[PDB]
Design an enzyme around this catalytic site. Structure first.
Site, short mmCIF file in Angstrom:
data_model
loop_
_atom_site.label_atom_id
_atom_site.label_comp_id
_atom_site.label_asym_id
_atom_site.label_seq_id
_atom_site.Cartn_x
_atom_site.Cartn_y
_atom_site.Cartn_z
N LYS E 158 0.82 -1.21 0.00
CA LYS E 158 0.00 0.00 0.00
C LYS E 158 0.86 1.26 0.00
O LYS E 158 0.52 2.24 -0.68
CB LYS E 158 -0.96 0.00 1.19
CG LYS E 158 -0.34 -0.31 2.54
CD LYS E 158 -1.40 -0.81 3.51
CE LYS E 158 -0.77 -1.45 4.74
NZ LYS E 158 0.03 -2.66 4.40
N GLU E 184 3.47 5.38 10.98
CA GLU E 184 4.26 4.51 10.12
C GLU E 184 5.70 4.48 10.62
O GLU E 184 6.05 5.16 11.59
CB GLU E 184 4.19 4.99 8.67
CG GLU E 184 4.91 6.30 8.42
CD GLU E 184 4.05 7.49 8.74
OE1 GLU E 184 3.02 7.30 9.42
OE2 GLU E 184 4.41 8.61 8.32
N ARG E 185 6.55 3.69 9.97
CA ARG E 185 7.95 3.60 10.33
C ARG E 185 8.66 4.91 10.01
O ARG E 185 8.43 5.51 8.96
CB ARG E 185 8.62 2.44 9.58
CG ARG E 185 8.11 1.08 10.02
CD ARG E 185 8.49 0.02 9.01
NE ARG E 185 7.54 -0.03 7.90
CZ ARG E 185 6.81 -1.09 7.59
NH1 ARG E 185 6.88 -2.21 8.29
NH2 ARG E 185 5.98 -1.02 6.55
N1 LIG Z 1 4.72 -2.43 -7.51
C1 LIG Z 1 5.53 -3.22 -6.79
N2 LIG Z 1 6.54 -3.85 -7.44
C2 LIG Z 1 7.35 -4.65 -6.73
N3 LIG Z 1 7.33 -4.92 -5.43
C3 LIG Z 1 6.33 -4.27 -4.82
C4 LIG Z 1 5.41 -3.43 -5.41
N4 LIG Z 1 4.51 -2.94 -4.47
C5 LIG Z 1 4.91 -3.50 -3.35
N5 LIG Z 1 6.00 -4.32 -3.48
C6 LIG Z 1 6.67 -5.08 -2.44
O1 LIG Z 1 5.75 -5.30 -1.39
C7 LIG Z 1 6.47 -5.38 -0.13
C8 LIG Z 1 5.81 -4.49 0.89
O2 LIG Z 1 5.85 -3.12 0.42
P1 LIG Z 1 5.30 -1.94 1.31
O3 LIG Z 1 6.35 -1.38 2.18
O4 LIG Z 1 4.61 -0.92 0.41
O5 LIG Z 1 4.16 -2.65 2.15
P2 LIG Z 1 2.90 -2.19 3.00
O6 LIG Z 1 1.70 -2.99 2.68
O7 LIG Z 1 2.76 -0.69 2.81
O8 LIG Z 1 3.40 -2.43 4.48
P3 LIG Z 1 2.92 -2.19 5.99
O9 LIG Z 1 1.72 -3.02 6.29
O10 LIG Z 1 4.14 -2.54 6.84
O11 LIG Z 1 2.66 -0.68 6.07
C9 LIG Z 1 7.93 -5.06 -0.44
O12 LIG Z 1 8.72 -6.24 -0.49
C10 LIG Z 1 7.86 -4.37 -1.81
O13 LIG Z 1 9.03 -4.62 -2.57
MG LIG Z 2 3.48 0.20 4.43
#
Ligand SMILES: Nc1ncnc2c1ncn2[C@@H]1O[C@H](COP(=O)(O)OP(=O)(O)OP(=O)(O)O)[C@@H](O)[C@H]1O
Ligand SMILES: [Mg+2]
Ligand SMILES: Nc1ncnc2c1ncn2[C@@H]1O[C@H](COP(=O)(O)OP(=O)(O)OP(=O)(O)O)[C@@H](O)[C@H]1O
Ligand SMILES: Nc1ncnc2c1ncn2[C@@H]1O[C@H](COP(=O)(O)OP(=O)(O)O)[C@@H](O)[C@H]1O
Ligand SMILES: [Mg+2]
Ligand SMILES: [Mg+2]
Lengths: 506, 51, 472, 166, 473
Positions: E158, E184-185
């Protein structure tokens, strides 16, 4: 504008007159204020559920009447209230203004004009908690409510005084059917026959103000606001206001019902009513019930819904039709509030996302969508005169009952398969396009004598539109005759069959 | 030309809102606060004497 | 001068009254307070202490203030009882609903009595001929017994109740009482006008059905006592008059639901999945007040609503122990089109044995039940894998069981609004012989559709011949 | 039938004391003795109310309540019973004294500091609350003016708010 | 005036009880003050307990709080700097500049707690914001005056989607933007700060178009629950006083309700369902109703929600569903299938997808895509156990077309190129609708399904198929 200046001057003079005529001594003192809750020491002779005024200017309703201090909920924010504030007593139970000037206006739960179009002309003032009509002062439902939706008209009939639930999931089309019915009522709302008038009253509990703005823009675009009243309880308002709004709208509709007219109430998203009541009960330290809900949510919903009824000729033969809406989480109809509401209503209209993504725009699950009234509260033209409109329910059950597990065995199975799939493609309709019974009858009548010969599935929609054109042109006599008399006579059946086969050959 | 008039209605009330600010700021700088207590005294007499 | 108390607290339906006088009304005493419209009545349930009693209100507590005068009636709720109550509509505290004047009677009985003793326990073995194929073939009904209509919302419990009324209540039965407990007022009006038009109740004449109504509109207190009022009137008819009455309760689950409704506010720790801790004892009292004594017979048919079509819910499960011939209705076969909707397997009765229904009837019932068992056991194979990979015997059993299960459907006289087909009443031996013939295999050539929505096997033959007719 | 409801919550002790006095006699002697006891306990606050802490054993409570009754046994009537019951029950003895005073004053005084729109302090030494408020208010406005400070009176501000709201 | 002073009686975790003096009771939601050795500790008032005692919420850690410490009343709600000077300055839940770039020179200071703007609400639901991402433009167009969903569990991407949006929308737009960043971090915040520095959106000696608010999980629950309102206040000041199109951004709104649940237990309220605060819907509605199009101005707010344990039925996500028009679920199953973005096309859903607004052709294309993708899910159970050979010819055609489509929804991102190795690409709406309609018509069925993975337009699919047939096969 000097006129509002002297209007405000006389307002202030009667404000003084009213304020300095109380000399109250039981006016209580606020002990403590919580999250929208205020226990108050005083009001020895306060009635239950009675409205109050705070010295700041916030209203309050007397829920808990335990000895010593009184539990007061807040119609608004606890922003301006402190400890040790004098709390004025109204002297009357919470009330909402009722009348015919409500039409074309948007108000809040209490009933204050919130649209900003001036004051409200109210013919009376009724309680928010009024008793439902008794067993005798009522009559069975016979007059049908024309929804304009073929799947909601020919399959799941509704009428004056029934309680049909739009059960379903999020953004499946729950509000769509209600707004379509509101638009469809314009056909008879523009006439003179009051026995066929259906004024619409709609509740908005929890929906954001942008959504209600789009909605009211919608009704005014199609010219339906003139016979509709919108009461709004956005999530921004306090829980008491949301909890109270549906009852006030019920009283609004009961005004028309008791005055001999006919009205329609849409209890949109009655679940957030339950969550607001949950917040109320929990903030009052009332012992909770199952899954943190207050125990008396079933009574809450029953008292609200059963107020809708079809009155008998003695009192005026008025009516009030309830149209509640409940949203379910992941299709779980076994959930508590969904079970209570499915057990409280006079039938239901199931909508699910799976059929919605299958192409069916109404997404009516005819397997579960049932009405406790069938032949009653249905136009006769969509009934025994059409013959199969008594028994399409069985046909649509069997066509689903032989999809692959009941694999096609002989030519009868193939015929039923084609018939059913052609019909399911036929029942599709688009939003913002209400239809009328006089052109419902030809389309589904063609569904019995020549439907498999339809010009392939992707082109059955313009088939139905062209059939409607071929019957509105050069065949207006059929549409008329079936629309005033409301049924199909023997010669009328012959003429309809002749026209259907004539366009089939076309 | 109608909703412009309607907006003319709404805007006119809006400067009347800040007019009250000018009004209320005029309310706080008077010796009437001394004179106003006599207004309660005569008023409260008229109140309970009715009973 | 009776005992006088003051209102001290009003929390929902809970009203707390302090009696300044040392004398206190006992629990289950009715209380009287002056409300502007009529007279709101209370009901002592607990003695809190310091001369204060906890009460539940039979009507709404709207408009009450702390300090209202409370009058002690000195006794439980008295309901008029007598032959004059026939054809009248009665509330939970006795007063009539229908605007036909006061109920002139000479007997007022309290609605709180004790169940009959074990020495008064009678027995019965007679079979109630109902005319419905399923409940006469698989779950026969016993005269002077308990009938339980288990089912969810929208399965057809009320329709079944109305059909049983129309069939049995007319003629067959000395008297009958119908108790509406937390149920739709529209359907109550439906019952009322069907009663008046059929002639079982005559407004300028003698009636046969007494009507007491507590619906969902009433507060919990009335919903928890209307069933007891119906019990009072039924027991009065059974004992004093020595008559065989037909107690027709609907949605008995609503009584326990109303009990759990005020359990939390009474100050009781909730039980499992949010019910009152005392449901078993109170409901057992209510049910054992429903029994056939040596003074008279009572035939009770009450529908039990299962919450979220779950048979393991505490309320229906605990009711199961109180019902002789349980007739559970299943949703699945209801959307399959069999609107009688009585589950052929789960619906079981105690009266089904070779010593009563006859050896041949027992054999036919056992064979049809095991055939349905075998059919439903093979549903996976047929559905996901396919029906072509079965043995010849497996297939033959499948078609036979399908024919039987759609043969279990019967027309209902009060279902013309939905079905549109005239109702059919098939007698016992007719059903037994027809199903025996279907079991043996004499009628295997008839297509399954001729078994759907029909009466006896003669109607099946007629339907098959006519289907061949328009099929040309 | 005590004149007022204290609604329990540590206040039932005062009602019990008042009822025990009313059943036979001595509505005043017990109350004046209790007032003297409160004066004594507030005389030495570091030894008076710190000793009402709950970290103090039962026989410690017996010792302290025995220590209370001195100076010609001022504890007269059932107040000694009140000290005893407070020894084996809730300890601190200030709030229920105020509740008992409130009750006895309602029995004899009936004075309330009303004024509605006026923030006066008109105590009324009369059981008839019918017109004596007029004399009390007249005396308290003619002289003193303790606070009488509404800061701003409600009607004009609330009326201006609702008018500008439309 | 005299300083309102009181004594601290109880310090219960993050909850502090203060006893005050004669008629000195402060107001609800009004800042208090404790002179801590580290700095200033404000005590936002939550509830009144009576007897001149108030229950308060601490915006900082309550370390070293002794009962009976002197407290000071500010006299109003928490006040934060507002104005164009805040652009380029990183502030906190209280408003102190945490960017150590000097004191903030704000001209106005506004209260944190405001009210919804009544019925002065316009409804312009006709501005399809061109995002660039193929999947969102088709099945759930983002409105320029709406509120954007971004749901999903842990590690579903996200935040990467938010970075893609800030890359594609913020750069080419006339109007200020605000990033609140709730819980967030700090690492993510630091990367985001740096990236806006190098890109040029914020210049330390320039204009700067973003006001940076920041409340991480290092803040106590009160700060994590108030920082969203603090950022919203900045957004409101820029929409009203400046009359600009604001572009409010958060990182996680679920943290707000989580902190509310944190403080609710010690605040003394009966727990709600699955241990949430009773005032979930009310408080969340208060937070999300102030963010609105607001006739004098307009706002777009890209919300972001964390689903607990991948439960879409959790009370907080279920409640926040109703206050969003354009939503994005980012299902995990799509993530382990390798299709990034992992958005579920069958649950994305938006109001703007109507023939009147987006066009009849686009509506039909989206509908047919939905049908093709839903047939696959319907037949999954049969395919999983038996296999595709047990299906009919039409079923086989539909399932292979669905596979090709759902592989074609993937799109490289200019932010996550390190995790893919393919440079990011952007596709216009007219290009993607035409490509999807071309694939739906069956014009490209001989193409291998693998050729639709990490591509843009249909021409990229053709080129990838050419390479795959050239060297791979
Ligand atoms: N478009 C993309 N292409 C490649 N990898 C992606 C893409 N979008 C997300 N990822 C991968 O998804 C993983 C998590 O990414 P991200 O930090 O955005 O997670 P999140 O859902 O925001 O996390 P959290 O719940 O900790 O806030 C990572 O390993 C990142 O490389
Ligand atoms: Mg995230
Ligand atoms: N007949 C229809 N034709 C086209 N689109 C439709 C139709 N019915 C519903 N929709 C669309 O489905 C979506 C949801 O419909 P609707 O506005 O009735 O919401 P809802 O089911 O009441 O949900 P909510 O509870 O979120 O308000 C909208 O995008 C609407 O445009
Ligand atoms: N034998 C039947 N024939 C036709 N319809 C039936 C039959 N039994 C049930 N139904 C349908 O089921 C619906 C619900 O019946 P009802 O008894 O009111 O539900 P419940 O069993 O929950 O009380 C009715 O509207 C009716 O159309
Ligand atoms: Mg909707
Ligand atoms: Mg029923």
């Amino acid at each position: 504008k000097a006129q509002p200046t002297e209007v405000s001057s006389i307002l202030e003079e009667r404000i003084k007159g009213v304020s300095d005529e109380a000399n109250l001594n039981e006016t209580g003192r606020v002990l403590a204020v919580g999250d929208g809750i205020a226990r108050v020491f005083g009001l020895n002779n306060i009635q239950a559920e009675e409205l109050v005024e705070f010295s700041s200017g916030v209203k309050g309703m007397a829920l808990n009447l335990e000895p010593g201090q009184v539990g007061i909920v807040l119609f608004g924010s606890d922003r301006l209230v402190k400890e040790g504030e004098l709390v004025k007593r109204t002297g009357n139970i919470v009330d909402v203004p009722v009348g015919p000037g409500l039409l074309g206006r948007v108000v809040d739960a209490l009933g204050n004009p919130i649209d900003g179009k001036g004051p409200i002309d109210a013919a009376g003032r009724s309680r928010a908690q009024v008793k439902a009509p008794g067993i005798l002062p009522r009559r069975s439902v016979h007059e049908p409510v024309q929804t304009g939706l073929k799947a909601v008209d020919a399959l799941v009939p509704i009428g004056r005084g029934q309680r049909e639930l739009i059960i379903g999931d999020r953004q499946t089309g729950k509000t769509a059917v209600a707004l379509d019915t509101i638009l469809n009522q314009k056909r008879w709302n523009n006439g003179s026959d009051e026995s066929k008038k259906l004024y619409c009253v709609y509740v908005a509990v929890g929906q954001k103000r942008s959504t209600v703005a789009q909605l009211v823009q919608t009704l005014e675009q199609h010219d339906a606001m003139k016979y509709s009243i919108i009461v709004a309880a956005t999530a921004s308002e306090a829980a008491p206001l949301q909890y109270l709004a549906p009852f006030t709208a019920a009283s609004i509709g009961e005004w028309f019902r008791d005055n001999g007219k006919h009205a329609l109430i849409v209890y949109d998203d009655l679940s957030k009513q339950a969550v607001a009541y949950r917040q109320l009960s929990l903030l009052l330290r009332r012992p909770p019930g199952r899954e943190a809900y207050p125990g008396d949510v079933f009574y809450l919903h029953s008292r609200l819904l059963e107020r809708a009824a079809k009155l008998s000729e003695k009192e005026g033969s008025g009516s009030l039709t309830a149209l509640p809406v409940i949203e379910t989480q992941g299709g779980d109809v076994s959930a508590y509030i969904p079970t209570n509401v499915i057990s409280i209503t006079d039938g239901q209209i199931f909508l699910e996302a799976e059929l919605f993504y299958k192409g069916i725009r109404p997404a009516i699950n005819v397997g579960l969508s049932v009405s406790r009234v069938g032949s009653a509260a249905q136009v006769k033209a969509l009934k025994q005169v059409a013959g199969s409109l008594k028994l399409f329910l069985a046909q649509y059950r069997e066509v689903a009952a032989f999809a692959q597990f009941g694999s096609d065995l002989d030519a009868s199975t193939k015929q039923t398969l084609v018939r059913g799939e052609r019909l399911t493609q036929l029942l599709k309709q688009n939003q913002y396009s209400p239809l009328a019974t006089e052109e419902q009858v030809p389309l589904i009548y063609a569904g019995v004598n020549g439907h498999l010969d339809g010009i392939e599935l992707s082109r059955i929609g313009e088939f139905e539109s062209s059939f409607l054109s071929y019957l509105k042109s050069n065949h207006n006599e059929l549409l008329t005759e079936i629309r005033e008399k409301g049924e199909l006579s023997k010669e009328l059946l012959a003429s309809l069959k002749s026209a259907t086969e004539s366009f089939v050959a076309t | 030309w109608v909703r412009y008039e309607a907006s003319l209605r709404q805007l006119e009330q809006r400067q009347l809102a800040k007019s009250v600010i000018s009004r209320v700021q005029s309310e706080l700088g008077n010796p009437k606060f001394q004179e106003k207590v006599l207004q309660q005294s005569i008023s409260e007499i008229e109140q309970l004497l009715s009973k | 001068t009776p005992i006088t108390g003051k209102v001290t607290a009003v929390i929902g339906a809970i009203v707390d009254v302090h009696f300044e006088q040392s004398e206190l009304p006992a629990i289950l005493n009715a209380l009287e307070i002056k409300t502007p419209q009529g007279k709101l009545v209370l009901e002592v349930a607990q003695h809190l202490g310091e001369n204060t009693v906890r009460t539940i209100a039979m009507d709404g507590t709207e408009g009450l203030v702390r300090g209202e005068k409370v009058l002690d009636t000195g006794g439980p709720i008295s309901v008029p009882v007598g032959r004059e109550t026939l054809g009248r509509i009665i509330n939970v505290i006795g007063e009539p609903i229908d605007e036909r004047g006061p109920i002139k009677s000479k007997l007022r009985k309290p609605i709180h009595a004790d169940p009959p003793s074990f020495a008064e326990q009678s027995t019965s073995a007679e079979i109630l001929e109902t005319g419905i194929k399923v409940v006469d073939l698989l779950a026969p009904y016993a005269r002077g017994g308990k009938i339980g209509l288990f089912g969810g919302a929208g399965v057809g419990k009320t329709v079944f109740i109305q059909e049983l009324i129309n069939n049995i209540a007319k003629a067959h039965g000395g008297f009958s009482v119908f108790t509406g407990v937390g149920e739709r007022t529209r359907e109550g009006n439906d019952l009322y006008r069907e009663m008046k038009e059929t002639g079982v109740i005559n407004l300028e004449g003698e009636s046969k059905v007494a009507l007491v109504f507590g619906q969902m509109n009433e507060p919990p207190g009335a919903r928890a006592r209307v069933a007891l009022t119906g019990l009072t009137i039924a027991e009065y008819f059974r004992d004093e008059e020595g008559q065989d009455v037909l107690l027709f309760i609907d949605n008995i689950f609503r009584f326990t639901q109303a009990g759990s409704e005020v359990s939390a506010l009474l100050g009781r720790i909730p039980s499992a999945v949010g019910y009152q801790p005392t449901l078993a004892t109170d409901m057992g009292l209510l049910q054992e007040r429903i029994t056939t004594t040596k003074k008279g017979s009572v035939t009770s048919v009450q529908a039990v609503y299962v919450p979220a079509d779950d048979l393991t819910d505490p309320a229906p499960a605990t009711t199961f122990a109180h019902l002789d011939a349980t007739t559970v209705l299943s949703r699945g076969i209801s959307e399959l089109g069999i609107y009688p909707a009585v589950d052929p397997l789960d619906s079981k009765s105690r009266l089904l044995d070779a010593a009563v229904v006859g050896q041949e009837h027992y054999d036919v019932a056992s064979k049809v039940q095991e055939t349905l068992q075998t059919y439903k056991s093979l549903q996976d194979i047929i559905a996901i894998l396919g029906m072509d990979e079965l043995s010849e015997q497996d297939k033959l059993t499948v078609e036979r069981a399908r024919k039987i299960q759609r043969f279990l459907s019967q027309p209902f006289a009060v279902a013309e609004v939905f079905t549109g087909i005239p109702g059919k009443l098939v007698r016992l031996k007719d059903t037994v012989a027809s199903f025996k013939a279907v079991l043996e295999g004499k009628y295997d050539n008839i297509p399954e559709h001729a078994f759907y929505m029909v009466g006896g096997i003669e109607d099946v033959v007629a339907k098959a011949e006519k289907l061949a007719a328009e099929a040309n | 039938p005590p004149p007022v409801r204290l609604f329990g919550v540590e206040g039932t002790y005062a009602t019990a004391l008042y009822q025990a006095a009313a059943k036979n006699s001595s509505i005043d002697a017990a109350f004046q003795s209790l007032q003297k006891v409160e004066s004594t306990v507030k005389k030495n606050p570091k030894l008076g109310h710190l000793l009402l802490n709950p970290a103090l054993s039962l026989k410690d409570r017996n010792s302290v309540i025995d220590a209370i009754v001195e100076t010609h046994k001022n504890l007269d009537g059932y107040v000694v019973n009140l000290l005893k019951v407070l020894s084996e029950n809730n300890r601190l003895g200030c709030f229920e004294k105020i509740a008992s005073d409130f009750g006895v004053l309602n029995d004899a005084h009936n004075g309330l500091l009303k004024g509605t729109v006026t923030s006066a302090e008109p105590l009324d030494p009369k059981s008839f609350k019918r017109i004596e408020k007029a004399l009390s208010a007249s005396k308290l406005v003619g002289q003193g003016k303790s606070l009488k400070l509404e800061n701003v009176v409600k009607p004009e501000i609330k009326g201006g708010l609702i008018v500008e709201l439309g």
